[PDB]
Write a protein that binds this ligand. Structure first.
Ligand code: 3RZ
Length: 844
């Protein structure tokens, strides 16, 4: 069909990479996964209620927090229903269904309740107190404005039609290293490794030969592992040294069909620069003219080789219990491993032991793996226990190459409601990088979830698209997942994603084109190019990628400008394209090149997770984790937090480009911007909370020592950090930033105390203690973040920072003292560090 031979060109420009291309593949695993995904996709489309899918209610089965209950007049929430112009207020109880909120308007004085100014529907059988939009209304002191209208037509979604034994040969596995060769450049040798989940099962090498643009060996490298002991997910890892590593490449020793890898191979190798997820890829370097390659041979006879509790002492029990207790990063000695293994059935009654128990497995032994599978059939406790995301994330990291282990963690995620899937989506997507195969329970889980809900589906799209555009190591695998998702979301979203891509691609060339001049001469062209695009180029509107609910209209040209950073970002403003928009505020997006916005994404995501850990304890630490979409390499968009200034600019205003930071200023600015002393005391309350929130979160993440220009505040007291790639993204110390100008708002002056400051410490202590209950979760997310998104900064010693910060092993009281001491390094230091940042960041 020419229709579905044009559709493929659409998907291709939507993905940013061509899936059908078969030039950089040495097998049919991708075709196999593309085909492989047809069933889970079609199963999901056929399974979704077309109406609830069309309206995508943003719901939560979580209890309504205290800070929102303690902000209720009397079991009464007010909604304002709009039509023509005619407003109308109804007396509604939190437990009121939105279906019954109409039987309180069609009788109390068919259709659907849509939020004013956004594509957000209050539909289905949920208590209204459970709609995400209702909770944010209660939080920010805002009236709930609904506009009655027609439900979208489900028919708008609708998708376009479609239609011997390895355990029987005891031979030592071997690889023939024919030789290497590099288009253009010493001593050089191949190192060959048989790996499984970062566990090296064997090591062999070749003889150091002279480094010539062509180096041959024709050697057979016999390993000490039997053909019959090779576990599925095992990688032949080939590497080149000289001693320093130069290039690597991997090859699954067992394919997607369970066949021992036989034949001839020429593999284009990945270069190094300057541990991480890129070193794990089964993908080869597409760049042929430049890459080093390697030629090998694997035995190829006949011959398809296919792959098919008692008592316990006391000091041992207590030794075992101490192992299960230890954090995810604490290492296991052979003694610990042999212990976990011997008492495996007793280790099975503790879900918390699974990562350590599965890590104590000798995967290079057929019989052992076989018994581990015996163990997996006795999974009742794991299956029954309450789902633990931190524990679940652990079995999906780089340390576990076995599909059956990985799949039990995916089985545990199936019971996550949409709300929670969004909290962990970015990291589940990054977790695909640790999958030995392109087709996994996780890749299908991501797919099943995207296809069932447009919010998860929208973000799943941008997340995959971000990776396809800047990761050559994982783009193929990611392009196959995106294509699977796009062939089932519906033509509605299909067309909708098309609008989005056109706009953002248009605005990126502009970003790059304006960047080419590093002035009044600049201010000129920017307004010229935005005049061009506004005609028959960018269509009427488009969804805001970081906020799927908002549709952005035309460019309010007058407000758009190039900003003053070494990298010249664009400050763009859009009219809301929705007439029902209660207001006339624009949509502010920053477009930039030079910031590894991938890093901000991972950080902002953990920031949303800490806001959620604080909710389990009725704490609102007022963080502003702004929308942020990475669109490629060192490029993307940033949501503009309205009514906000940089702390340094508030200083540069009444001291100006100096360092003579007056402790008086911030409080002057806050009073300057407050219309009443009522609003001033809220702007002070929001400050204490916001400051405490960032102080802890920042400290825990090891991004506490920040420059003055990289901390912002709203005219309403909300402080917040920015530019998360600018630190460990390109990196005397302060633990976090708690300067004298902040402290002066709180009431204190240098070495004193005030009510707000004690409130400050009591929030900080609570907040800091509240996260320590999720030590394991945070350690794993922090760990996964460094492997998948922090190029260079791994070491493992960078990871182990979080252990120290989270003061693991320490009891509560010892942990409260440690934090208060950290608040003291701040008190002691005052302006020392900020001053060095000016001395460093503004002058050298
Ligand atoms: C999040 C936010 N909001 C602003 N109002 C803003 C205003 C000026 C500059 C930046 C900014 O540079 N943010 C970032 C974040 C990552 N890179 N740059 C801003 N970021």
């Amino acid at each position: 069909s020419e229709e579905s031979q044009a559709f493929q060109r659409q998907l291709t420009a939507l993905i940013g990479y061509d899936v059908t291309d078969v030039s950089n593949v040495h097998d049919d695993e991708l075709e196999f996964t593309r085909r492989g995904l047809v069933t889970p996709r079609m199963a999901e489309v056929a399974s979704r209620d077309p109406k609830l899918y069309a309206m995508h209610p943003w719901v939560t089965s979580k209890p309504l927090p205290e800070y929102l209950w303690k902000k209720i007049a009397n079991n009464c929430i007010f909604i304002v229903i709009h039509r023509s112009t005619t407003s109308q207020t109804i007396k509604v109880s939190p437990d009121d269904t939105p279906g019954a909120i109409l039987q309180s308007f069609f009788t109390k004085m068919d259709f659907v309740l849509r939020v004013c100014g956004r594509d957000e529907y209050l539909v289905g059988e949920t208590p209204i107190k459970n709609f995400q939009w209702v909770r944010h209304c209660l939080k920010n002191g805002e009236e709930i404005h609904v506009v009655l209208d027609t439900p979208p037509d489900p028919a708008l979604d609708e998708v376009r039609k479609e239609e011997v034994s390895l355990w029987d040969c005891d031979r030592k596995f071997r690889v023939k290293i024919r030789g290497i060769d590099i288009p253009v450049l010493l001593t050089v040798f191949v190192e060959a490794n048989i790996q499984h989940g970062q566990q090296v099962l064997c090591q062999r090498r070749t003889s150091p030969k002279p480094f010539t643009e062509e180096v041959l060996w024709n050697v057979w490298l016999e390993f000490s592992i039997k053909i019959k002991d090779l576990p599925k997910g095992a990688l032949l890892n080939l590497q080149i040294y000289c001693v320093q590593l130069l290039y690597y490449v991997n090859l699954l020793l067992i394919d997607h069909r369970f066949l021992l890898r036989r034949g001839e191979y020429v593999l284009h190798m990945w270069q190094i620069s300057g541990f991480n997820a890129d070193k794990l890829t089964s993908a080869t370097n597409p760049d042929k003219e430049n890459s080093m390659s390697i030629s090998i041979l694997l035995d190829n006879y006949c011959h398809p080789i296919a792959l098919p509790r008692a008592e316990m002492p006391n000091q041992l029990r207590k030794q075992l219990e101490a192992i299960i207790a230890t954090d995810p990063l604490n290492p296991l000695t052979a003694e610990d491993k042999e212990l976990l293994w011997h008492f495996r059935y007793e280790s099975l009654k503790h879900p918390k032991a699974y990562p350590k128990l599965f890590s104590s497995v000798k995967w290079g032994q057929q019989e052992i793996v076989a018994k581990t599978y015996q163990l997996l059939a006795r999974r009742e406790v794991w299956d029954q226990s309450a789902l633990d995301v931190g524990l679940t994330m652990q079995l999906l990291d780089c340390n576990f190459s076995d599909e059956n282990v990985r799949a039990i963690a995916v089985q545990k995620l199936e019971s996550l409601e949409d709300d929670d899937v969004l909290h962990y989506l970015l990291q589940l997507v990054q977790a695909v990088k640790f999958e030995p195969y392109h087709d996994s329970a996780l890749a299908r889980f991501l797919l099943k979830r995207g296809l069932r809900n447009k919010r998860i589906g929208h973000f799943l799209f941008w997340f995959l698209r971000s990776e396809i555009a800047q990761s050559r190591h994982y783009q193929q695998r990611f392009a196959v997942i995106l294509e699977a998702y796009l062939r089932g979301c519906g033509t509605a979203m299909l067309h909708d994603f098309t609008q989005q891509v056109q706009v953002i691609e248009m605005l990126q060339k502009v970003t790059l084109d304006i960047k080419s001049l590093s002035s009044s001469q600049v201010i000129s062209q920017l307004k010229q190019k935005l005049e061009n695009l506004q005609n028959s180029q960018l269509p009427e509107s488009f969804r805001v990628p970081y906020d799927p609910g908002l549709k952005a209209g035309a460019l309010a040209i007058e407000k758009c400008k190039v900003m003053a950073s070494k990298k010249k970002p664009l400050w763009l403003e859009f009219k809301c394209a929705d007439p029902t928009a209660l207001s006339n505020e624009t949509i502010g997006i920053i477009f930039k090149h030079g910031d590894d916005l991938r890093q901000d994404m991972l950080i902002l995501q953990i920031l949303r997770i800490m806001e959620s850990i604080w909710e389990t304890e009725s704490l609102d630490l007022c963080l502003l984790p702004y929308g942020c979409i990475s669109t490629g390499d060192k490029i993307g968009m940033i949501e503009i937090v309205k009514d906000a200034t940089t702390i340094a600019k508030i200083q540069q205003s009444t001291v100006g480009n100096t360092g003579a930071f007056k402790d008086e200023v911030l409080n002057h600015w806050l009073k300057e911007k407050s219309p009443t002393e009522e609003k001033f005391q809220a702007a002070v309350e929001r400050f204490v909370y916001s400051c405490a929130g960032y102080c802890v979160a920042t400290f825990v993440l090891g991004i506490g020592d920040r420059h003055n220009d990289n901390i912002m505040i709203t005219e309403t007291g909300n402080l917040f950090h920015i530019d998360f790639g600018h630190i460990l993204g390109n990196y005397e110390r302060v633990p976090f930033v708690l300067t004298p100008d902040f402290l002066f708002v709180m009431g204190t002056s240098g070495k004193k105390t005030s009510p707000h400051f004690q409130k400050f410490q009591d929030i900080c202590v609570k907040a800091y203690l509240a996260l320590r209950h999720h030590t394991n979760l945070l350690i794993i997310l922090f760990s996964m973040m460094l492997m998948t998104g922090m190029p260079q900064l791994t070491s493992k010693e960078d990871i182990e920072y979080i252990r120290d910060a989270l003061t693991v092993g320490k009891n509560e009281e010892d942990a409260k003292k440690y934090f208060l001491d950290q608040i003291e390094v701040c008190r002691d230091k005052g302006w020392t560090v900020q001053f060095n940042w000016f001395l460093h960041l503004v002058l050298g």
